[PDB]
């Protein structure tokens, strides 16, 4: 089930990669048996980085960034949301 993680930026960044579609919307796909529009996901986690320490894992699907729903979102929208804060990031993720 979805869970909320808070991550505080190191000067190297949050320590993860986000991967997903360029466009908006698109075909539905179930994640852990629940139906969603396309979700961006965590494609890498830096060992010992901020995201790793906060409990983010490879493959986590991103449902919200900083309180904003990103189901079906463009990659740009998700990256821009990740960059909204000077140093803090709150994600709602679904581990697979």
């Amino acid at each position: 089930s979805p869970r909320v993680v808070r991550i505080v930026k190191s000067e190297s960044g949050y320590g993860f990669n986000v991967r997903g579609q360029v466009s908006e919307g698109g075909q539905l796909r179930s994640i852990n048996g629940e139906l969603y529009a396309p979700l961006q996901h965590v494609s890498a986690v830096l060992p010992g980085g901020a995201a790793d320490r906060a409990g983010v894992r490879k493959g986590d699907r991103i449902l919200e960034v900083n309180g904003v729903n990103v189901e079906g979102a463009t990659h740009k929208q998700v990256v821009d949301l990740i960059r909204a804060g000077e140093k803090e990031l709150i994600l709602t993720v679904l581990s697979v």
């Binding site: 960044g13 949050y14 990669n17 986000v18 991967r19 579609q21 360029v22 494609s43 990659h75 990740i82």
Partner: peptide
Amino acid sequence: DDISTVV
């Protein structure tokens, strides 16, 4: 194809 960003 999907794309990636380091953050």
